[PDB]
């Protein structure tokens, strides 16, 4: 890359209740959109989890009387974004937290890995995307960890062979969503990942919530020796283990949450709580654009480098990232020579000055300007093949 990544996950289910369409992305701030998620079968078959959201939904300017076989849905909307933002690459993300059960089987044989690569790359080239993100949560043992590398090498091989025929000289990107927990990342073939991948999206969040015995920072940088119950994990120990394990610092993109985890009936950070309570869309989880709530004040753990709203009246504490937290995390990643910022996920961000993604863009400065691809002469969709001209 020729600068920092400022990447964001865009969810295909966000077009429904969250009403967040690809045209809603503030694309000027973004180097990579990671389109989430494709589903996976045990025989390695990559499939759409929602054909409506992916390529069937007609937006206002999508003709119900055009000739040929055409892609609509988020695929055409994201191609429009790529046309208007030549420095913005779109990656196809496969798996995710809820859809990782079939990865061990999918990676387990040469035939299943070839089927995974062919079906994944078929979507990528039909939809007019710039690469593939493997979101396998998470390889469980040495067999799975080894098979993950064999799978990534098969995808890399087939991407290079596809480019040689249908996008000569273009480098399709291959990335993973990577775990921040040592129980998970100690099982990975880190040096192999460091060699085969363009980027490792480090999921440096979900450190504490309903699954934690006490209130914790969700995404803190450092251990708090004074209040260690508040920092059950920290980003810094994971980042150092990834780099020392053989992932080059410049390939590590530091993930950051655009949501908070709430703790109810609590005196503060590192302490007893009872329930996670309500959420924006699911129990205990709040969109950043809904934070801080009315009457809550933002406190700061300057050791663990964690911000959290506290409401003295309601006793609600919400761990979440603020614009100031983003400035600190950007200073941190530049200090370690990391590849940039990643965000989960786009729909929850604020607009204007208080955009976490926009704060990251201004704090990073020199963003990746590597050009995307607009030429898909082997796309089965006439409108994509014709670049929506
Ligand atoms: C590799 C890895 O572990 N990545 C982590 C992410 O997976 C994780 O974010 C969470 O991801 C899961 C899917 O993996 C996602 O699940 C979705 O949940 C929503 C409800 O919030 C469902 O949305 C509905 O979809 C239907 C149509 O299918 C709509 O009709 C309806 O309107 C939708 N309702 C709402 C309220 O939006 C999705 O169907 C469902 N998707 C899947 C594929 O199961 C979670 O919401 C994600 N969690 C958060 C907090 O965003 C992430 C954060 O924990 O960590 C990642 O890096
Ligand atoms: C650092 C670490 O290993 N944390 C684990 C958490 O990631 C994980 O919580 C779950 O993480 C998912 C993706 O990161 C979230 O989408 C999901 O909402 C969350 N689960 C719940 C119930 O909130 C848990 C596994 O439950 O283990 C932690 O140790
Ligand atoms: Zn609904
Ligand atoms: Zn139609
Ligand atoms: Zn290359
Ligand atoms: Zn590369
Ligand atoms: Zn800029």
From Swiss-Prot:
Coiled-coil regions listed: none
Compartments, record wording: Secreted
Active site per database record: 137
Temperature dependence, free-text field: Optimum temperature is 45-50 degrees Celsius.
UniProt keyword annotations, A-Z: Carbohydrate metabolism, Chitin degradation, Chitin-binding, Cleavage on pair of basic residues, Glycoprotein, Glycosidase, Hydrolase, Polysaccharide degradation, Secreted, Signal, Zymogen
PROSITE patterns per UniProt: GH18_1, GH18_2
Record: glycosylation sites: 184
GO molecular function, one term: endochitinase activity
UniProt-listed Enzyme Commission number(s): 3.2.1.14
Lineage: superkingdom: Eukaryota
Induction field: Specifically induced by chitin and is catabolite repressed.
Domain (GH18): residue spans on this chain: 4-367
One GO BP annotation of this record: chitin catabolic process
Protein's UniProt keywords contain Hydrolase: yes
Functional note: Secreted chitinase involved in the degradation of chitin, a component of the cell walls of fungi and exoskeletal elements of some animals (including worms and arthropods). Plays a morphogenetic role during apical growth, cell division and differentiation (cell wall morphogenesis). Also acts as an antifungal agent. Involved in the degradation and further assimilation of phytopathogenic fungi, namely mycoparasitism, the major mechanism accounting for the antagonistic activity against phytopathogenic fungi displayed by Trichoderma.
Family: Belongs to the glycosyl hydrolase 18 family. Chitinase class V subfamily.
Name of the protein in its database record: Endochitinase 42
Record organism: Trichoderma harzianum
């Amino acid at each position: 890359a020729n600068g920092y990544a400022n990447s964001v996950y865009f969810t295909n289910w966000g077009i429904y209740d969250r009403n967040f369409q690809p045209a809603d992305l503030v694309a000027s701030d973004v180097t990579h959109v990671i389109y989430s998620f494709m589903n996976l079968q045990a025989d390695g078959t990559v499939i759409s989890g929602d054909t409506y959201a992916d390529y069937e939904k007609h937006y206002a300017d999508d003709s119900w009387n055009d000739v040929g076989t055409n892609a609509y849905g988020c695929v055409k909307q994201l191609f429009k974004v790529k046309k208007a933002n030549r420095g913005l690459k779109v990656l196809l993300s496969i798996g995710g937290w809820t859809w990782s059960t079939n990865f061990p089987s999918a990676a387990s044989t040469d035939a299943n890995r070839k089927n995974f690569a062919k079906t994944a790359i078929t979507f990528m080239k039909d939809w007019g995307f710039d690469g593939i993100d493997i979101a396998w949560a998470y390889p469980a043992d040495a067999t799975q960890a080894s098979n993950m590398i064999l799978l990534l090498k098969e995808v890399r091989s087939q991407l290079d062979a596809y480019a040689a025929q249908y996008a000569p000289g273009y480098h399709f990107l291959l990335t993973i969503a990577a775990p921040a927990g040592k129980d998970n990342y100690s099982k990975l073939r880190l040096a192999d990942l460091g060699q085969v991948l363009d980027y490792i999206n480090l999921m440096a969040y979900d450190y504490a919530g309903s699954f934690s015995p006490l209130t914790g920072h969700d995404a803190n940088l450092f251990n708090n020796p004074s209040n260690p119950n508040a920092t059950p994990f920290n980003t810094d120990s994971a980042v150092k283990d990834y780099i020392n394990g053989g992932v080059p610092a410049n390939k590590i993109v530091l993930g950051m949450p655009i949501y908070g985890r709430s703790f109810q009936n609590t005196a503060g950070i590192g302490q007893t709580y009872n329930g996670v309570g309500s959420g924006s869309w699911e129990a205990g989880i709040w969109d950043y654009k809904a934070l801080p709530k009315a009457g809550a004040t933002v406190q700061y753990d300057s050791v663990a480098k964690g911000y959290y709203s506290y409401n003295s009246a309601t006793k609600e504490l919400i761990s979440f990232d603020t614009p100031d937290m983003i400035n600190t995390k950007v200073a941190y990643l530049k200090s370690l020579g990391l590849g940039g910022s990643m965000f989960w996920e786009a729909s929850a961000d604020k607009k204007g000055a208080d955009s976490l993604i926009g704060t990251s863009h201004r704090a990073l400065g020199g963003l990746d300007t590597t050009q995307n691809l607009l030429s898909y002469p082997n796309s089965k969709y006439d409108n994509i093949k014709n670049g929506l001209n």
